[PDB]
C-alpha cells in the first residue's frame, strides 16, 4: 500500500521529454519574475488559525530539475506557478498572483481602487489586499469587476467589500450578462457532485512532493478550510462591447459569453494599453469539459472571441494580463500569443468535426489526433497542463453528438458494478483478472491495467490486492502525465483505492446560499426533494414574501416539485407568509421550522401540517461519496 | 452462423406477454381520441415527380385491428396502431387536421376568405397530398396565412409545395415564425451534417423493411419520408415578445414563445376563438428526446417543463381540446389539464431526479439503472411512455448536460478506442472461440444485453468473424423484439441488418435544396471543417472575399492548417481577393460550376496571388454519409 517509486519504463519515458521539448527557452521565467515588488512564500490562515493557502509546501520545486516520478514539462509549469506575490504591470496597475488559484488585478485611479476579481476565498482576498497595502497607499474600493461566473473570481468579495455599499451604489460592481443565473446554477444545483469531483481535480487530500501533488496547471492547488462569498453585482454588461468610466479609470468590456464560462468577458484598459482576457486565453490548454463536472464549452465561440479580441485590441495592447498566471509583454508577443490561442481552439472544434464527419467516434478521435498542428506543438503556453487534448476532442464529440457513439451495442450500457462483475467472470475470475493485471504493470501498460482493476474493484471492493494494484498502475500514470489535473486525479485515485475518503469539507465555511432569491432556493428544494418518499404526498404550497412583494406557488405532484414565480394557487393546501431574511435563517439551518411558527416569523393559512411534511421529504447531500469504489 | 431474421425466442415471447398485464391496454381513450373526427381515411401511397414512393401507409397493414406479435413489445404495437389512424379529421367546425400523411401534422384553420395553416409538413409532395385530401372534402380556398410552429424540417419542409415565396415577399400570404427561425432552420440542419445524416439512418429504420419482425413504428410517426423534396420559404412576420396576439382572415392567434425547449426557435399557438391549444412538439403523447440518437446538442428539461407549466397556467382553464403537430388530440379541459401537468412533471423529474442522484454521487449509467420508471401516476400514462425519447438515455443526457461524458473516476479518464479495446478484451476473455462460446451462453440464458457487449468486442477486433457478426445481430434483433422504444427498435434492427450484410446506396436529402440558403459565413465554417489540417500545414495564406450582391466582406486566414474567419472585415495585406456574388458562390459550392471556368467567364475576379485560391480548394476533404457504425 506504500507510494511505489518510478518504474524502469516510467523513468525512461520522462527522461525522453527532456529532449524534443524547449527547456532552453526561459521566456516564461522572465515574464513571471518581471514586476516582482514583494514575494510570497508563506501561509494564509483562517479565523480558527487553520491553514488556507501554503506556498512553503512546494519548496522541493525551487531552482532544481525534475524527479523520475514527475514529467519534466509538468515540473517546468510547477516552477513557474511558484512565482508568487505582488507585481507591478505598469504604474497605477498591480497584480496579486499565487496567493490563491486565481489573480487579483488592482487598478489605482482617482480616489480609491478598482478591482478586477476578488479571488476564491474571503481569507485570500483579504491577504492579497493586505500584501498590496504593505507596499502601496491605503485607499478604499470604489469599484469591483467580476470577469466571469467562477468561484475563483467572485468568492472573496465579502472579505473585502460590503453588500450594503453595493446596494447603495457607493461601490460599483460590474459583471457580464447572466452572472447571477450562472454563478448560482452551475455551482450549487450540481454543487455537491461538482465539489467532491473537484477534489480529484485539486489533489487537496494528496500531500505535496515529487511522489505526490506538485501543481494544478493554472495554479498550485485549491484553497482549504476557507469561506466562499457571493455579493450580487451592481451594473450588468449586456452589449457585446461596453465602455465605462469609474474613478477616472476607463474600462472597455467585451462580452465573451459561453467560452471559458457561460457569463464571461474581457476587460481592455484604453488608458494603459493593457488587455485582460480573464481565463479566456491562459498559458496552458484550457478545458472544454472540466473534470469536476460542468456544461461543455463552445471551442468555435472561444476561438472567435480570442480573434475578436486580437482584431479590436491587438494593435492597441502592449501587455496582456490574465486572472491566472503571468502577463505577456510587447505588442508582437501578445499578437503571436493571441493568434496561437485562437488557432488552438479552432483546431479542436474543426479537426474533431472533420473526423466526426468521417465516422470516427469520441475515443477513436482522441487516439487519432495526439498533437497540435504546425508550430502549436512547440509553444510552452499551448501544452496540455490544465485541459487535455484527448479530453477536449472527446468533449467536441459530446457537445455536437453526445455520449452515445451511434453503435447500438452502447445504447444501454451496464452500470460500473454490474459491468465489472460480468467482465471479471468473462475474464476467468478475480484471480485470473489479478494475474492479467500484474502482467500489464510488468509490461508497462498501466492504461490497460487500470481498466481491469476498475472491473475488479467495482465487482468486489473487498479485494485489497486488486485495489493496491490498480492504485500502483494509476500512480505510474500520474508520474508519467504532463497534465496537472490528470496527475491530481490519478494521485487522488491511488490514495483512496489504498485507504479511502476521510472527514473534511472547505465549502462548509462557505455561505454561498445566502445571496439566493426564493426561486433559486426553491429550485434547490426541487433537487433536494426525495421522489421516492415524496410519492403520495401531493400538495400545493403558496409562499408570500412581504419584504419582497413576491408571491410564489409551489406544487408537489408525483414526487416532483414545480414552481410558478408571481403566481398564487387559489386552492392551495397551505400559505406561507414570511420574509427573505427569515427564509434565509431556515435555509442556513440556524432557525428551526416550529420555532419560527411559534415566534410569529412564519405565519400559516390552511393546512399548516403540510409545511413540516414538505420539509421532511427533503434530502441532505454530503460531498464525500465514493468515486473509485461504490457510493 | 445463420443470417436470416430469427423469430421470437422462448424468453422474448414470455417477456412480451408479461407486458400485457402491468400496463393499461383496458384504457382505449387514445384509440377513441385518434378515431374521433375522422372525415376521410388515408391508407395509400404518395409518389415523387419521378413516380417513386415518398410515403406508404399500406406497408403497415399487419398492425390493423389485431394484437401484438411475439416479435414486438405490446406497448410499442399499441403506439404503432394509433399512428396508423391517418387522414383528414375535424377537431371543431372550421378546424381540421391532416395526420399520418407525413412524420408531422398540418393544422388547417378555415377563416373569413382563405386558409390559415399551422405547419407545412416535411416534404413538398406530402404538403401537396395533405392539402389535396383536405380539398376533396372541404371548399377550395387560397392560403392567406402560414404558421411555422418551430425550426424543424418536418414543420417548414413542404412550404414551397403549396405556397410561393413571391406571394410571401409581396405580403399576400402572412408567414409567422418564432424569434431566430432563419438562423436555426439553416444552422442546426446544415452544419455537422454528414455524421448526423448517417446516424439518423439508425434512428429512422428507413433501410429496414416493414413488418412484425422488422420496422413497425417511429413513436411520434411511422417512419421518415423517402425520395422527397425539402423546402425553406422565409417567414414574413417574426414573433419576438413572450406572448403575441395576431389576427388574420378573422382568425385570432395568440403565440407563446417556448425558445430552447424541443427546438431553439419554438412556440405554442392558442386559438382564443376555438378554445383549442396547439403545443407544436412541446408535449407529444410519448417521451421526447433530451439527446436525439442521430446526434445533437443536449436540450434543457428544466426550461421545457417551465414552458409546459406556463402553457398550463395561461391556457389550461381556457382550453377544451389540445392539438399537436405530431399525433392525436386530447379532448376535455380536465383531460388536457392532467395531460399538461403530467408532461410538465415528466420533464422536471428528468432534470431534478438526475441532479438529485448526481449530488449523491451516482454516475450516468448508475442513474439509468436506478431509475427504471417515472414516479407516482406517471408510470400508468400511455402518453408518457418511452416510445421516442428514452428514460435511460434522457437521464444519461441530464448527466452529460450538467457534468459531461466523464464520470469522475480516473480509470475512465482515457478509454481505449473500440477496435483497440475489443482486441485486448477478447484476448483477456480467452480468445475469439472462448468469447463466441460465452456469447452463445448469454443468448441461451436470454441475457442479450451482455451478449451484444461481447459481440461488439469481437466484431471490432476482427469484423471478418462471420459467426460473431451473426450472433451479435441475433442478440440485437431480440433486444429490438423486446424494446418499447420505437427509435431503439429502429436502431437495433438497422444494427442487426448491417452486421449481417452491410451498408447499401441511397439519399432523400438529394432532392432537397436546403443548402442553397447558406450565408457565406456558414459556407466558410463548413470549409474550416472540410479543410485537411495534415496537407494544409505549410500552406499559410489569407484570402479576402467580397460579395457585391450582399455588400458583405469576409476575411479568411489559413494558419497552421487551421482556417479562421472575420465577417465584415478585410485583411489589408491579403494574399488573394475574391470578388463574386452569392449565386455564383452557390454554383461553385454545388459543384455545378468549376473554379477556372468561373475565372474565365468573369463571374470570379481575382486581385493578388490568384494561384492561392485553387491551392486553398485543393486542401478541402469530401465527406460521404455511409461510414460503418457497427464495424
Ligand atoms: Zn474561470
Ligand atoms: Zn479562474
Ligand atoms: Zn420538432
Ligand atoms: Zn416535429
Which CATH number fits the domain that encloses residue B440?
1.25.40.880
Can you tell me which residue has the cell 448491417? B498
Beta-sheet pairing, A141-145 with A172-176: parallel
Q: Report the distance separating Cα A150 and Cα A117, nearest Å.
A: 10
Burial A13-44 (b: 16+ CB within 10 A, else e): bbeebeeebeeeeeebeebbeebeeebbeeeb
The CA A251 to ligand 4 mean position distance, Å, reads: 47
Neighbours of B506 (CB within 10 A): 12
- Among candidate residues A450, A86, A577, A409, the one with its CA nearest the CA of residue B498: A409
Asked if residue B460 lies in contact with residue B419, where contact means CB atoms within 8 angstroms, the answer is yes
> Is residue A411 a known part of a binding site?
no
Interface check B313 vs A, CB under 8 A: yes
Asked if residue B265 lies in contact with residue B176, where contact means CB atoms within 8 angstroms, the answer is no
- Among candidate residues A589, A602, A584, A600, the one with its CA nearest the CA of residue A163: A584
Asked if residue B480 lies in contact with residue B492, where contact means CB atoms within 8 angstroms, the answer is yes
Å from B73 to nearest chain A CA? 17
Alpha helices in B360-431 (DSSP H): 364-371, 391-402, 418-428
Q: Is B87 in the same domain as B100? A: yes
Neighbours of B22 (CB within 10 A): 9
Asked if residue A184 lies in contact with residue A520, where contact means CB atoms within 8 angstroms, the answer is yes
Q: Report the distance separating Cα B253 and Cα B450, nearest Å.
A: 53
Q: Report the distance separating Cα B194 and Cα B228, nearest Å.
A: 18
What is the torsional sign of CA B602, B604, B609, B611? Answer: negative
Asked if residue B494 lies in contact with residue B202, where contact means CB atoms within 8 angstroms, the answer is yes
- A120 contacts: CB under 8 Å, gap ≥ 6: A100, A101, A102, A151, A152, A155, A156, A222, A223, A226, A228
What is the torsional sign of CA B176, B178, B182, B187? Answer: negative
CA A179 vs CA A255, A513, A550, A565: distances in Å: 12, 15, 22, 20
Identify each DSSP E strand in B341-447 by its residue range: none
Total count of residues recorded for chain A? 631
Tell me which residues of chain A, numbers 553 to 612, contact chain B at a CB-CB cutoff of 8 Å. 557-562, 564, 567
Asked if residue A471 lies in contact with residue A493, where contact means CB atoms within 8 angstroms, the answer is yes
Q: Report the distance separating Cα B149 and Cα B282, nearest Å.
A: 10
For the record, the C-alpha cell of A324 comes out as 491566472
Q: Is B240 in the same domain as B280? A: yes
Can you tell me which residue has the cell 490514495? A495
Chain A residue with Cα closest to B624: A358
Alpha helices in B36-100 (DSSP H): 74-82
- A605 contacts: CB under 8 Å, gap ≥ 6: A574, A575, A577
Q: Is A285 in the same domain as A382? A: no
Q: Report the distance separating Cα A35 and Cα A54, nearest Å.
A: 22
The angle formed by the CA atoms of residues B368, A422 and A451, to the nearest 5 degrees, is 85
Where residue B577 sits, what CATH number does that domain have?
Answer: 3.30.1050.10
- Among candidate residues B385, B394, B476, the one with its CA nearest the CA of residue B77: B385
Using DSSP's 3-state secondary structure scheme, residue A267 falls into strand
Q: Is A392 in the same domain as A539? A: no
Q: Report the distance separating Cα A377 and Cα A393, nearest Å.
A: 16
Q: Answer yes or no: do A627 and B397 touch at CB < 8 A.
A: no
- B262 contacts: CB under 8 Å, gap ≥ 6: B150, B280, B281, B282, B288, B299, B304
Neighbours of A243 (CB within 10 A): 11
Given B306, B333, B361, which residue is the final one in a domain?
A: B361
Give the burial class of A170: count Cβ atoms within 10 A of its Cβ; 0-12 exposed, 13-18 middle, 19 or more buried.
middle
Q: List, in sequence order, every residue forming a beta bridge with A105; answer none if it has no partner.
A: A95, A116
Q: State chain A's maximal CA–CA distance in angstroms.
A: 77
- DSSP secondary structure, A115-146, as one string: EE---SSHHHHHHHHHHHHTTS----EEEEE-
Q: Which of A197, A343, A448 sits opposite B564 (nearest CB)?
A: A343
- Backbone torsions φ then ψ of B436, nearest 5 degrees: -65, -35
Residue B100 region, left (φ>0) first, then alpha (ψ -120 to 50), else beta?
left
Å from B111 to nearest chain A CA? 35
> Is residue B457 a known part of a binding site?
no
Given A359, A386, A415, which residue is the final one in a domain?
A: A359
For the record, the C-alpha cell of A381 comes out as 503556453
- Among candidate residues B536, B495, B506, the one with its CA nearest the CA of residue B624: B506
Residues in A touching B397 (Cβ below 8 Å): 402-403
Please provide the distance, in angstroms rounded to a whole number, between the alpha carbons at the two ends of chain B. 18
Q: Which of A194, A363, A373 sits opposite B533 (nearest CB)?
A: A373
Given A298, A327, A359, which residue is the final one in a domain?
A: A359
Q: State chain B's maximal CA–CA distance in angstroms.
A: 77
Chain A residue with Cα closest to B344: A562
Q: Is B481 in the same domain as B508? A: no
- A64 contacts: CB under 8 Å, gap ≥ 6: none
Asked if residue A227 lies in contact with residue A123, where contact means CB atoms within 8 angstroms, the answer is yes
Give, to the nearest 10 degrees, the angle between helix A446-459 and helix A430-443. 160
Can you tell me which residue has the cell 432556493? A521
Interface check A377 vs B, CB under 8 A: no
Q: Report the distance separating Cα B161 and Cα B14, nearest Å.
A: 48
For the record, the C-alpha cell of B95 comes out as 378546424
Asked if residue A348 lies in contact with residue A118, where contact means CB atoms within 8 angstroms, the answer is no
Asked if residue A296 lies in contact with residue A400, where contact means CB atoms within 8 angstroms, the answer is no
Q: Is A260 in the same domain as A393? A: no
The kind and range of the H/E element at B567 are strand B562-567
Q: Report the distance separating Cα B456 and Cα B472, nearest Å.
A: 7
Task: Residue B525: give the domain boundaries.
Answer: 504-631
- Backbone torsions φ then ψ of B320, nearest 5 degrees: -100, -35
Q: Is B261 in the same domain as B290? A: yes
Q: Report the distance separating Cα B106 and Cα B124, nearest Å.
A: 13
Neighbours of B510 (CB within 10 A): 10
Q: Is A476 in the same domain as A555? A: no
CA A56 vs CA A38, B437, B586: distances in Å: 16, 60, 64
Give chain B's radius of gyration (CA, Å). 26
Asked if residue A493 lies in contact with residue B413, where contact means CB atoms within 8 angstroms, the answer is no
- Among candidate residues B129, B174, B171, the one with its CA nearest the CA of residue B148: B174
Q: Report the distance separating Cα B100 and Cα A432, nearest Å.
A: 57
Q: Answer yes or no: do B453 and A414 touch at CB < 8 A.
A: yes
Task: Give, as residue ranges, everything with CB less than 5 Å from ion ligand 1.
Answer: A 150, 279
- Among candidate residues A237, A256, A628, A306, the one with its CA nearest the CA of residue A466: A628
Q: Report the distance separating Cα B501 and Cα B438, nearest Å.
A: 23
A426, A542, A620: best to mutate for the B interface, most B CBs within 10 A? A426
Tell me which residues of chain B, numbers 526 to 555, contact chain A at a CB-CB cutoff of 8 Å. 528-533, 537-538
> Is residue A455 a known part of a binding site?
no
Where residue A107 sits, what CATH number does that domain have?
Answer: 3.60.15.30
The angle formed by the CA atoms of residues B524, B527 and B529, to the nearest 5 degrees, is 120
Asked if residue B102 lies in contact with residue B57, where contact means CB atoms within 8 angstroms, the answer is no
DSSP B113: S
Q: Is A212 in the same domain as A290? A: yes
Question: Resolution in A for the shown PDB structure?
Answer: 2.7
Q: Report the distance separating Cα B242 and Cα B225, nearest Å.
A: 33
Q: Report the distance separating Cα A313 and Cα A308, nearest Å.
A: 8
Asked if residue B154 lies in contact with residue B103, where contact means CB atoms within 8 angstroms, the answer is yes
Residues in B touching A422 (Cβ below 8 Å): 450, 453
Asked if residue A87 lies in contact with residue A94, where contact means CB atoms within 8 angstroms, the answer is yes
- Among candidate residues B196, B145, B103, the one with its CA nearest the CA of residue B623: B196
Can you tell me which residue has the cell 469536476? A292
For the record, the C-alpha cell of A12 comes out as 525512461
- How far does Cα B436 stand from its chain's mean position? 36
The CA A262 to ligand 1 mean position distance, Å, reads: 10
Residues in B touching A560 (Cβ below 8 Å): 345, 348-349, 352, 375
Q: Identify which ligand lies nearest to the alpha carbon of B119.
A: 4
Q: Is A441 in the same domain as A490? A: yes
Please tell me the total count of domains within chain A.
3
- Among candidate residues A153, A157, A219, A149, the one with its CA nearest the CA of residue A177: A149
Å from B209 to nearest chain A CA? 18
- Among candidate residues A596, A575, A574, the one with its CA nearest the CA of residue A586: A596
The angle formed by the CA atoms of residues A478, A481 and A486, to the nearest 5 degrees, is 65
Q: Answer yes or no: do B355 and A190 touch at CB < 8 A.
A: yes
Q: Is A475 in the same domain as A525? A: no
- DSSP secondary structure, A436-450, as one string: HHHHHHHHT-HHHHH
Q: Identify which ligand lies nearest to the alpha carbon of A222.
A: 2
Q: Is B560 in the same domain as B458? A: no
For the record, the C-alpha cell of B194 comes out as 454528414
- Among candidate residues A219, A59, A40, A36, the one with its CA nearest the CA of residue A127: A40
Give, to the nearest 10 degrees, the angle between helix B520-530 and helix B582-589. 30
Q: Identify which ligand lies nearest to the alpha carbon of B154.
A: 4
Amino acid at each position: 500500500l506504500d507510494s511505489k517509486p518510478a518504474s524502469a519504463i516510467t523513468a525512461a519515458k520522462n527522461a525522453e521529454v527532456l529532449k524534443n521539448l524547449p527547456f532552453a527557452d526561459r521566456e516564461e521565467f522572465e515574464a513571471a519574475k518581471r514586476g516582482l515588488i514583494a514575494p510570497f512564500s508563506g501561509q494564509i490562515k483562517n479565523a480558527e488559525g487553520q491553514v488556507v493557502w501554503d506556498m512553503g509546501a512546494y519548496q522541493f520545486l525551487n531552482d532544481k530539475d525534475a524527479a523520475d516520478t514527475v514529467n519534466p514539462s509538468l515540473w517546468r509549469q510547477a516552477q513557474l506557478n511558484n512565482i508568487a506575490g505582488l507585481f507591478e504591470v505598469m504604474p497605477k496597475l498591480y497584480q496579486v498572483r499565487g496567493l490563491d488559484p486565481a489573480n487579483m488585478t488592482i487598478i489605482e485611479g482617482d480616489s480609491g481602487l478598482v478591482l478586477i476579481d476578488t479571488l476564491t476565498t474571503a481569507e485570500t482576498a483579504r491577504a492579497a489586499l493586505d500584501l498590496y497595502f504593505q507596499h502601496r497607499p491605503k485607499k478604499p474600493i470604489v469599484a469591483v469587476v467580476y470577469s466571469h461566473s467562477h468561484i475563483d473570481h467572485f468568492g472573496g468579495a465579502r472579505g473585502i467589500i460590503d453588500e450594503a455599499d453595493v446596494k447603495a451604489g457607493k461601490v460599483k460592481v460590474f459583471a457580464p450578462s447572466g452572472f447571477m443565473e450562472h454563478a448560482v446554477s452551475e455551482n450549487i444545483l450540481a454543487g455537491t457532485a461538482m465539489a467532491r469531483r473537484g477534489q480529484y481535480q485539486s489533489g487537496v487530500m494528496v500531500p505535496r512532493g515529487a511522489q505526490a501533488q506538485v501543481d494544478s496547471g493554472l495554479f498550485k492547488t485549491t484553497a482549504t478550510n476557507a469561506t466562499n462569498t457571493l455579493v450580487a453585482p451592481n451594473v450588468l454588461i449586456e452589449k457585446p462591447y461596453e465602455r465605462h468610466t469609474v474613478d477616472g479609470v476607463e474600462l472597455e468590456f467585451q462580452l465573451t459569453l459561453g467560452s471559458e464560462a457561460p457569463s464571461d468577458m474581457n476587460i481592455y484598459l484604453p488608458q494603459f494599453k493593457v488587455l485582460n482576457t480573464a481565463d479566456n486565453a491562459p498559458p496552458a490548454m484550457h478545458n472544454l469539459l472540466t473534470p469536476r463536472g460542468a456544461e461543455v464549452r463552445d471551442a468555435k465561440a472561444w476561438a472567435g472571441y480570442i480573434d475578436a479580441s486580437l482584431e479590436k485590441y491587438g494593435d492597441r495592447t502592449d501587455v496582456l494580463i490574465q486572472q491566472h498566471n503571468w502577463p505577456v509583454w510587447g505588442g508582437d508577443k501578445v499578437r503571436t500569443y493571441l493568434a496561437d490561442q485562437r488557432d488552438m481552439y479552432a483546431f479542436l472544434n474543426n479537426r474533431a468535426l472533420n473526423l466526426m464527419n468521417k465516422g470516427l467516434t469520441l475515443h477513436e478521435i482522441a487516439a487519432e489526433v495526439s498533437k497540435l498542428p504546425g508550430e502549436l506543438d512547440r509553444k510552452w503556453y499551448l501544452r496540455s497542463y490544465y485541459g487535455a487534448l484527448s479530453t477536449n476532442l472527446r468533449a467536441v464529440y459530446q457537445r455536437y453528438l453526445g455520449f452515445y457513439d451511434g453503435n447500438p451495442a452502447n445504447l444501454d450500457p451496464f452500470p460500473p458494478v454490474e459491468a465489472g462483475k460480468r467482465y471479471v467472470e468473462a475474464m476467468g475470475g478475480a484471480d485470473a483478472v489479478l494475474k492479467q493485471m500484474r502482467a500489464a504493470i510488468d509490461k508497462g501498460d498501466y492504461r490497460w491495467a487500470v481498466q481491469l482493476g476498475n472491473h475488479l474493484v467495482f465487482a468486489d471492493p473487498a479485494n485489497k490486492d486488486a485495489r493496491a494494484l490498480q492504485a500502483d498502475a494509476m500512480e505510474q500514470l500520474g508520474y508519467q502525465t504532463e497534465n496537472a489535473l490528470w496527475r491530481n486525479m490519478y494521485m487522488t485515485g491511488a490514495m483512496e483505492l489504498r485507504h479511502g475518503v476521510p472527514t473534511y469539507d472547505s465549502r462548509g465555511k462557505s455561505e454561498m446560499g445566502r445571496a439566493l432569491t426564493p426561486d433559486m432556493f426553491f429550485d434547490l428544494l426541487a433537487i433536494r426533494l426525495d421522489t421516492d418518499k415524496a410519492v403520495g404526498h401531493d400538495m400545493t404550497l403558496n409562499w408570500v414574501f412581504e419584504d419582497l412583494k413576491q408571491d410564489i406557488a409551489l406544487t408537489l405532484r408525483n414526487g416532483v416539485l414545480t414552481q410558478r414565480v408571481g403566481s398564487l394557487n387559489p386552492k392551495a393546501d397551505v400559505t406561507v407568509k414570511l420574509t427573505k431574511p427569515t427564509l434565509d435563517q431556515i435555509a442556513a439551518r440556524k432557525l428551526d421550522l416550529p420555532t419560527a411558527i411559534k415566534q410569529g416569523t412564519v405565519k400559516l393559512d390552511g393546512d399548516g401540517k403540510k409545511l413540516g411534511e414538505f420539509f421532511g421529504l427533503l434530502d441532505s447531500f454530503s460531498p464525500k461519496f465514493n468515486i473509485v469504489e461504490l457510493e
